Enzyme design. Structure first.
Site, PDB file in Angstrom:
ATOM      1  N   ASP A  35       0.840  -1.193   0.000  1.00 45.03           N
ATOM      2  CA  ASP A  35       0.000   0.000   0.000  1.00 45.03           C
ATOM      3  C   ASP A  35       0.878   1.247   0.000  1.00 45.03           C
ATOM      4  OD1 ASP A  35      -1.937   1.904   0.276  1.00 45.03           O
ATOM      5  OD2 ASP A  35      -2.428   1.369   2.371  1.00 45.03           O
ATOM      6  N   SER A 199      -0.559  15.600 -11.989  1.00 45.55           N
ATOM      7  CA  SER A 199      -0.806  15.267 -13.377  1.00 45.55           C
ATOM      8  C   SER A 199      -1.034  16.531 -14.197  1.00 45.55           C
ATOM      9  CB  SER A 199      -2.005  14.318 -13.476  1.00 45.55           C
ATOM     10  OG  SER A 199      -2.388  14.079 -14.810  1.00 45.55           O
TER      11      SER A 199
END
Length: 330
Positions: A35, A199
């Site tokens: 994770d 992004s």
């Protein structure tokens, strides 16, 4: 040193991925959910409330000659999906894919919430976010990667998740045969303890690319892709019959649909998520309403590049003094 381990979807939807991890002496092998969105290595154990164990493999520290109680240490964690676990702490030897750390904090669960009990395939979590998020008290503990870093040939790990197929976690090296083209690296903020990056935009299907900054986290422990409501609405508007259902808890679409791809920007580069990766199947057995793999982050507080996004790429988690993330097509 290096390590290399195969990671395997837990089910036919890729709801999560499990990677075998050796703990203790002699080794006890548990299948852990790696994770990159958390920083605790915790396991089902001989200490876990019996009624909360249903099929998981447990770690038994009393059978490990290298286990030592970390005296006074406790831990307690809550995840973004509302699940939780807590317990005490041992140090022990932990190996992943041939890479061994001695003295790793292994957090032994005394209690786990129902969603963990109900998932017999996941024996615990191995956190790979920054150690500043580790919940052990009163002495915070380091992640497996943080403990291994100095010994690694290069201070990196990579995630190569499969679509409906196994993939690979590598530690300490970049397998140049595992991706196409070049790796594009992008800046990371560690201020929230996550692999947080920006992004450069998105496209839906064959549509034109929209240049817009989207801050979010690379999180292998989250199944889906969670993005701003504007972006998610633009995606689902291209799917006839798709709608946001408050009763189901997100966007659903007719199972008869063919989904468009979704592209996200990494600098000047582009990662394309095929439409099929966005199909999470019937909302309930036999339903013709299917659950979408791109969902709004509006209620979370952060955008999450979960498995839906990451499995479309070869992803480099660069833990150099200034961390960065790398993405390549594959």
């Amino acid at each position: 040193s290096t390590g290399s381990a195969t990671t395997t979807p837990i089910d036919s939807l890729d709801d999560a991925y499990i990677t075998p991890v050796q703990i203790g002496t002699p080794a006890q092998t548990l299948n852990l959910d790696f994770d990159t969105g958390s920083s605790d290595l915790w396991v089902f154990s001989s200490e876990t409330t019996a009624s909360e164990v249903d099929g998981q493999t447990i770690y038994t520290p009393s059978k490990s000659t290298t286990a030592k109680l970390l005296s006074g240490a406790t831990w307690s964690i809550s995840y973004g999906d509302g699940s939780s676990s807590s317990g005490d702490v041992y140090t022990d030897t932990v190996s992943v894919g041939g890479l061994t750390v001695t003295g790793q904090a292994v957090e032994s669960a005394k209690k786990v919430s129902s969603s963990f009990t109900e998932d017999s395939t996941i024996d615990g979590l191995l956190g790979l976010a920054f150690s500043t998020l580790n919940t052990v008290s009163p002495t915070q503990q380091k992640t497996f990667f943080d403990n291994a870093k100095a010994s690694l040939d290069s201070p990196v790990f990579t995630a190569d998740l499969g679509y409906h197929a196994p993939g690979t976690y590598n530690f300490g090296f970049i397998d140049t045969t595992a991706y196409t083209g070049s790796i594009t690296y992008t800046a990371v903020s560690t201020k929230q303890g996550f692999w947080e990056w920006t992004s450069t935009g998105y496209a839906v299907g064959s549509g034109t690319f929209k240049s817009t900054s989207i801050d979010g986290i690379a999180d292998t422990g989250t199944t889906l892709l969670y993005l701003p409501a504007t972006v998610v609405s633009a995606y689902w508007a291209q799917v006839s019959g798709a709608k946001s259902s408050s009763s189901v808890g997100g966007y659903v679409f007719p199972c008869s649909a063919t989904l468009p791809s979704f592209t996200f920007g990494v600098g000047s580069a582009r990662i394309v998520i095929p439409g099929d990766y966005i199909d999470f199947g019937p909302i309930s057995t036999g339903s013709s309403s299917c659950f979408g793999g791109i969902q709004s982050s509006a209620g979370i507080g952060i955008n999450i590049f979960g498995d839906v996004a990451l499995k479309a790429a070869f992803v480099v988690f660069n833990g150099a003094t200034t961390p960065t993330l790398g993405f390549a097509s594959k």
